[PDB]
Amino acid sequence: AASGVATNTPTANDEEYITPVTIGGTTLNLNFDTGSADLWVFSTELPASQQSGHSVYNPSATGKELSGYTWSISYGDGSSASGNVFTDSVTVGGVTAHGQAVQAAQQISAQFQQDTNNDGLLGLAFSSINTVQPQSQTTFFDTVKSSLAQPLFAVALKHQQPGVYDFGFIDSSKYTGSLTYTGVDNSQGFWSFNVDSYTAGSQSGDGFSGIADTGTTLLLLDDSVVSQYYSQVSGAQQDSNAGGYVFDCSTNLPDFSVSISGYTATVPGSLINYGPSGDGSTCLGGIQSNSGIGFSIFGDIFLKSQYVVFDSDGPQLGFAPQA
Amino acid sequence: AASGVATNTPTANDEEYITPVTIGGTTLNLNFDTGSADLWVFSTELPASQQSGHSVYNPSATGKELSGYTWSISYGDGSSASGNVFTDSVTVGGVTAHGQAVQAAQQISAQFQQDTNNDGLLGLAFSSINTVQPQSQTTFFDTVKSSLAQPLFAVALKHQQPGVYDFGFIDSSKYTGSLTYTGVDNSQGFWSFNVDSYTAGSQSGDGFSGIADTGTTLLLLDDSVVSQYYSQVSGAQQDSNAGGYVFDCSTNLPDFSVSISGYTATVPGSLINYGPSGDGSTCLGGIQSNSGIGFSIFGDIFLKSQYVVFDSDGPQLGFAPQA
Ligand SMILES: COC(=O)[C@H](Cc1ccccc1)OP(=O)([O-])[C@@H]1Cc2ccc3cccc(c3c2)CC(=O)N[C@@H](C(C)C)C(=O)N1
Ligand SMILES: COC(=O)[C@H](Cc1ccccc1)OP(=O)([O-])[C@@H]1Cc2ccc3cccc(c3c2)CC(=O)N[C@@H](C(C)C)C(=O)N1
Ligand SMILES: *[C@H]1O[C@H](CO)[C@@H](O)[C@H](O)[C@@H]1O
Numbered sequence: 001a002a003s004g005v006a007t008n009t010p011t012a013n014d015e016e017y018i019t020p021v022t023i024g025g026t027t028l029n030l031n032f033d034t035g036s037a038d039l040w041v042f043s044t045e046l047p048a049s050q051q052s053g054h055s056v057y058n059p060s061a062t063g064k065e066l067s068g069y070t071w072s073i074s075y076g077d078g079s080s081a082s083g084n085v086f087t088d089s090v091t092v093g094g095v096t097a098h099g100q101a102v103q104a105a106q107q108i109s110a111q112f113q114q115d116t117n118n119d120g121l122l123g124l125a126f127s128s129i130n131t132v133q134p135q136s137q138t139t140f141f142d143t144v145k146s147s148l149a150q151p152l153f154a155v156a157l158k159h160q161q162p163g164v165y166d167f168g169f170i171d172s173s174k175y176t177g178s179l180t181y182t183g184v185d186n187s188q189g190f191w192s193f194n195v196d197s198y199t200a201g202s203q204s205g206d207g208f209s210g211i212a213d214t215g216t217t218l219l220l221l222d223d224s225v226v227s228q229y230y231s232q233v234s235g236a237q238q239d240s241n242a243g244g245y246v247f248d249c250s251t252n253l254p255d256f257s258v259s260i261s262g263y264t265a266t267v268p269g270s271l272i273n274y275g276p277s278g279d280g281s282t283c284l285g286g287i288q289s290n291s292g293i294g295f296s297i298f299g300d301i302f303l304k305s306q307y308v309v310f311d312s313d314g315p316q317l318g319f320a321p322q323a
Numbered sequence: 324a325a326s327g328v329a330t331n332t333p334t335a336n337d338e339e340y341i342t343p344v345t346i347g348g349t350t351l352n353l354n355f356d357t358g359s360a361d362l363w364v365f366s367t368e369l370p371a372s373q374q375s376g377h378s379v380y381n382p383s384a385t386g387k388e389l390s391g392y393t394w395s396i397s398y399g400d401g402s403s404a405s406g407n408v409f410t411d412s413v414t415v416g417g418v419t420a421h422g423q424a425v426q427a428a429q430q431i432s433a434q435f436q437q438d439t440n441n442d443g444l445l446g447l448a449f450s451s452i453n454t455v456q457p458q459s460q461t462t463f464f465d466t467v468k469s470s471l472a473q474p475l476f477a478v479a480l481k482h483q484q485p486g487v488y489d490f491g492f493i494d495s496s497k498y499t500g501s502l503t504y505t506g507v508d509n510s511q512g513f514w515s516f517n518v519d520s521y522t523a524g525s526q527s528g529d530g531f532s533g534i535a536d537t538g539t540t541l542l543l544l545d546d547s548v549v550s551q552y553y554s555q556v557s558g559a560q561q562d563s564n565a566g567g568y569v570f571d572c573s574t575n576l577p578d579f580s581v582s583i584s585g586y587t588a589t590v591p592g593s594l595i596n597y598g599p600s601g602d603g604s605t606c607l608g609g610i611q612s613n614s615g616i617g618f619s620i621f622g623d624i625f626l627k628s629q630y631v632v633f634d635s636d637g638p639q640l641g642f643a644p645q646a
């Protein structure tokens with residue numbers, strides 16, 4: 001049975017986490033994203049000037065073209081990318097997917113043309129939301145899952161330290177105590193789960209649903225919860241230059257917790273300070289608005305406090321505090 | 324119980340079929356497409372110069388905006404469109420969907436900027452492939468289906484004559500004999516079905532699968548079947564100016580048939596002559612290549628010969644020769 005461990009590393013301010021992935025013998029640094037289902041990479045099909053500063057996939061050398069197939073994806077921040085499709089070998093943490101669909105970029109929006117930290121994204125949401133047309137393809141995890149020792153992957157993202165993505169097995173040394181599981185609703189293709197309640201500092205509130213999403217940097221919540229939280233932070237103020245609420249870097253931030261099937265997942269206040277706002281000398285808060293979409297995004301700020309198991313059997317999510 | 328009849332009308336050469344749809348009190352001419360699941364329309368959000376020659380939806384007057392939601396779609400021919408989303412009333416053939424998601428265009432590719440024949444497309448494929456993010460929306464048919472007398476719609480497209488889309492009931496006067504049903508595989512979101520064999524003129528062959536697709540003008544088949552068919556047409560030749568095989572307009576074209584669950588669906592040769600090629604004085608053939616995608620597209624050329632029932636119970640497709 002297969003299993004493997006891929007090491008991830010945060011970029012500045014933990015804005016994103018990269019992990020090396022070898023495709024057709026070329027290694028590229030990808031952003032693993034449990035919030036989408038496409039594996040796409042910068043390629044030789046892009047104009048030369050856009051290839052600069054990136055490791056790029058050359059489909060002609062090793063890939064098998066799927067004639068007539070295309071892909072196009074748009075993310076929550078408005079960025080987008082599109083291209084054609086080839087099958088090729090893809091290795092992550094020593095685990096190899098033969099015949100994995102690789103989406104070669106032909107066009108990318110400005111956000112991507114600016115970020116030299118990654119060479120593409122590897123989707124780990126459910127395959128039902130893969131964008132390939134006319135027939136969608138399976139994510140790397142769905143392609144290999146029947147070969148793994150257990151059909152699951154687990155993640156430990158950390159603050160300014162290397163972390164891991166465990167494929168096919170659980171590393172019990174990565175968390176304290178036992179894991180608590182909760183059911184997943186995959187109807188919209190996400191790893192969605194319910195929380196029974198929350199506690200933002202000195203105020204508690206009713207439950208809501210949200211998605212476990214490694215691809216999103218912040219913890220995005222309802223406007224009402226955001227207001228409740230920052231009402232407790234002395235001097236907090238919105239600053240559109242920074243992208244949301246900011247406050248003096250020395251501020252004592254309250255914790256934020258959610259109850260999930262009897263388990264209390266706590267994000268300590270220190271993790272909620274995302275870092276310098278890059279506008280004056282204030283810091284940006286890890287908690288910000290979800291723009292009214294109706295559900296919460298449990299991004300990197302939250303994930304840094306927990307070891308999370310994504311189990312296809314159920315499906316279900318397991319949580320415990322990182323050790 | 325509800326039911327209704329919407330009248331469709333072909334544009335020049337039956338290139339596409341339009342049907343009026345009222346949205347928030349404004350009537351727009353849309354292309355009904357069983358091959359996709361998005362209802363999108365030209366809107367006031369487009370630059371003014373792109374609105375010219377179209378009836379356009381004004382979301383500010385009557386729609387409820389879904390904050391943070393967006394859509395982006397790319398079709399087989401490479402054309403694309405994207406925008407935001409509002410809910411509003413949508414009426415088709417006297418049947419009204421309250422709260423239907425309407426995708427307002429913000430950007431459209433050149434193909435759309437050129438076609439003044441339609442103001443958008445109304446998708447009738449399965450909702451699982453609707454492109455709205457972060458959570459997909461239901462097609463007009465899925466929105467109203469529980470209210471219809473029977474959860475199905477049926478279509479009769481015709482050559483240079485008005486046709487119909489029956490919602491919620493079957494008009495037995497539209498076909499000869501009884502309907503023959505076959506099972507549908509909706510796993511990729513299409514109305515996909517299997518044929519046991521085919522007969523192209525004097526040559527027969529093994530079966531394959533394909534999709535019933537009102538949105539595609541031609542009958543797109545495997546390259547091998549296309550070659551077999553045109554080998555029988557005297558003088559047939561490929562002409563990239565016309566887009567495929569062309570031949571003298573006076574030519575006698577052989578019939579094309581497929582066997583579906585014991586029923587023989589026959590497309591008479593006269594329907595296979597699509598019309599003038601718009602290159603010299605040859606005519607373009609109704610049968611052309613599917614570019615190697617692995618399944619066939621039963622487009623308008625095929626549908627003109629049959630009355631087709633799209634039944635959500637099963638799901639299943641029913642066929643009989645048009646009367
Ligand atoms: C296609 O679905 C995604 O975009 C899914 C789910 C979704 C969909 C629509 C709206 C909101 C959320 O997010 P994701 O794949 O994790 C997606 C991954 C992603 C892709 C491009 C990015 C470019 C710049 C910065 C970020 C990016 C993140 C940081 C960031 O957190 N961005 C968020 C927005 C929300 C602040 C974001 O777009 N994240
Ligand atoms: C998003 O899925 C569609 O495009 C589905 C299925 C599909 C997907 C990918 C590849 C092939 C087929 O096709 P459709 O919705 O019926 C889609 C509807 C559509 C949309 C825009 C068009 C613009 C110009 C001309 C046509 C258009 C047809 C005539 C035409 O037959 N075009 C074909 C290509 C195939 C000749 C077409 O794009 N048709
Ligand atoms: C992950 O688990 C597999 C299967 O037990 C091992 O073979 C591998 O070395 C790693 O421990």
Ligand SMILES: *[C@H]1O[C@H](CO)[C@@H](O)[C@H](O)[C@@H]1O
Pocket residue numbers: 005006007008162164
């Ligand atoms: C990735 O790399 C780290 C150290 O660089 C290891 O701890 C991990 O097991 C994986 O090999």
Ligand SMILES: *[C@H]1O[C@H](CO)[C@@H](O)[C@H](O)[C@@H]1O
Pocket residue numbers: 324325326327472491492
């Ligand atoms: C379609 O069917 C409905 C339900 O029987 C009728 O009410 C309607 O007039 C049309 O015949």
Ligand SMILES: *[C@H]1O[C@H](CO)[C@@H](O)[C@H](O)[C@@H]1O
Pocket residue numbers: 328329330331485487
């Ligand atoms: C649409 O219009 C035609 C005639 O224009 C009718 O036959 C059809 O029933 C529907 O009303």
